[PDB]
Design a protein around this ligand. Structure first.
Ligand SMILES: NC(=O)C1=CN([C@@H]2O[C@H](COP(=O)(O)OP(=O)(O)OCC3O[C@@H](n4cnc5c(N)ncnc54)[C@H](OP(=O)(O)O)[C@@H]3O)[C@@H](O)[C@H]2O)C=CC1
Length: 476
């Protein structure tokens, strides 16, 4: 099927045991000084050895760090690699309430390295930011956001990007040796998870063909909340839910009833017999969300959430992105989804569906803020499954007809790259296959691999795509 052919999923496959020698040259370790106490942080610093130079990245000051780094690189000469432990800073930034401090500090470290002329490859370490291997628990969705930023750094600064490595809970000596071995030579891999049974790396595969009933999807009923539900994709999802018999759709956006197209949307939905509530309110306002949930009918309790609230604009290259831009991109994604998760965790929902993007799953040049925000969604869905709660993340490709991609501009960058506009009916039917399977994560995208693979790999290989045969064929 055509709908099957839009669905892909991320897998983690075993790779080679690394060598036994640590890096010959000197490592530079970067530490968040208020967040240096986690066990894995001390285990990593121990594994890097006492000869490793240590840089405490204090606060968020690009210019100060550029100066400090330039001084270090003057004194030492070229480093073998930069190893960042900034991801351990999960606390929100004091001035940007939707940006984890470690995310802010990572962006500014990537900036200041470039400013100071350090060219050693940057490796970003996380602990629990991916779900890798049968039974693996994604414990930190906040650290998971950093992977969407890293993948973009790999596309914008391939020559000075090492990669991302997720550590296990307990970094024992076998885990330490895998780490230091990868830092010496990672065999062309750059998205890695170190686990008790081996080193795994991240891979994209075609999803298994749809099996109706396998996931035991309950019938759509009760109240269903679609955030961004007046927006392009949210609207077409609400119309599908309505076709499928929802009792009550609750559609939100910051403009609510004043959003473009809302009256027409409400009328088309109501002709289907559905009760329609359209509310103005910001998905990152916890008190407004709570108030909205408090209003639901006894006869129509919340059964499902579809989180389509989002903006992509006002992003910038890694070298230029500000923290205020990053905060505005994170707000509807990390802040709003955290709220949705927390206020629905006891409700036994049938579906909790987060709309992510291919920018998070692949990386996309020019979109670091949006990739980090959407990668947090994907990680939160995995996290929620670990809690025994239902959750789905869908990393859409480009939609045709409706939504944020419908305009020649930076629709054309993507299209020239092989990421094609999907027909909405096909995208919706593929999402329906995913929910019928009860799959936790998918990318749903129409790709021309012959165009995409060579373009995406021109500066650097991508081990991610070696499990897509069309990409292997395009590179042959
Ligand atoms: N269209 C596509 O090709 C792709 C879409 N996606 C994702 O799908 C989702 C929907 O995208 P699409 O329908 O195309 O985009 P739209 O711009 O058409 O809709 C997005 C919307 O979310 C609402 N929104 C934005 N910020 C907030 C907020 N803080 N609180 C509540 N609502 C908010 C907007 O209304 P308002 O401005 O009034 O708040 C609008 O309803 C987005 O999350 C997007 O990132 C991912 C990849 C591709």
């Amino acid at each position: 099927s055509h709908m099957d052919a839009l669905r892909y999923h991320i897998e983690w496959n075993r790779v080679a045991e690394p060598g036994t020698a640590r890096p010959a040259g000197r490592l530079l370790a970067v530490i968040s000084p208020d967040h240096a106490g986690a066990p894995w942080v001390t285990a990593v610093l121990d594994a890097l050895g006492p000869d490793t130079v240590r840089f405490e990245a204090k606060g968020t000051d690009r210019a100060a760090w550029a100066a400090q780094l330039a001084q270090l690189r003057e004194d030492e000469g070229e480093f073998h690699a930069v190893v960042s432990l900034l991801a351990a800073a999960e606390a929100l930034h004091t001035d940007h309430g939707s940006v984890p401090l470690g995310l802010a500090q990572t962006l500014l470290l990537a900036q200041a390295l470039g400013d100071a002329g350090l060219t050693a490859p940057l490796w970003c370490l996380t602990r629990g930011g991916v779900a890798a291997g049968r039974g693996d628990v994604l414990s930190s969705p906040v650290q998971g956001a950093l992977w969407g930023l890293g993948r973009v750094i790999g596309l914008e600064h391939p020559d000075r990007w090492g990669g991302l490595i997720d550590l296990p809970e307990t970094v024992d000596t076998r885990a330490a040796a895998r780490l230091t071995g990868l830092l010496a030579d990672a065999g062309g891999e750059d998205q890695l998870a170190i686990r008790g049974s081996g080193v795994l790396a991240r891979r994209l595969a075609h999803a298994a063909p749809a099996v109706p009933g396998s996931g035991k999807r309950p019938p759509v009923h009760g109240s269903v909340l679609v955030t961004g539900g007046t927006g392009g994709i949210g609207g077409r999802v609400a119309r599908r839910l309505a076709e499928q018999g929802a009792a009550h759709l609750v559609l939100t956006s910051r403009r609510g009833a004043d959003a473009p197209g809302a009256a027409e949307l409400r009328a088309e939905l109501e002709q289907l017999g559905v009760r329609v509530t359209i509310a103005a309110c910001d998905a990152a306002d916890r008190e407004a969300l709570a108030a909205l949930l408090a209003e639901l009918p006894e006869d129509a309790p919340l059964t499902a959430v579809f989180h389509s609230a989002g903006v992509a604009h006002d992003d910038a290259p890694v070298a230029d992105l500000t923290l205020g831009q990053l905060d505005a991109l994170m707000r509807a994604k990390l802040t709003a989804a955290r709220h949705l998760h927390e206020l629905t965790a006891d409700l036994d929902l049938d579906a909790f569906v987060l709309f992510s993007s291919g920018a998070a799953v692949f990386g996309s040049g020019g979109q670091p803020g949006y990739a980090a925000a959407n990668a947090y969604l994907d990680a939160l869905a995995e996290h929620r499954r670990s809690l025994g709660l239902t959750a789905s993340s869908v990393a859409w490709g480009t939609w045709g007809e409706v939504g944020m991609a419908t305009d020649p501009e930076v629709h054309d960058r993507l299209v020239r790259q092989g990421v094609l506009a999907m027909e909405p009916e096909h995208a919706l039917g593929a999402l329906d296959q995913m929910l019928e399977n009860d799959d936790t994560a998918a990318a749903i995208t129409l790709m021309d691999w012959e165009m995409f693979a060579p373009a995406f790999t021109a500066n650097r290989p991508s081990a991610l795509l070696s499990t897509v045969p069309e990409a292997v064929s395009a590179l042959s």
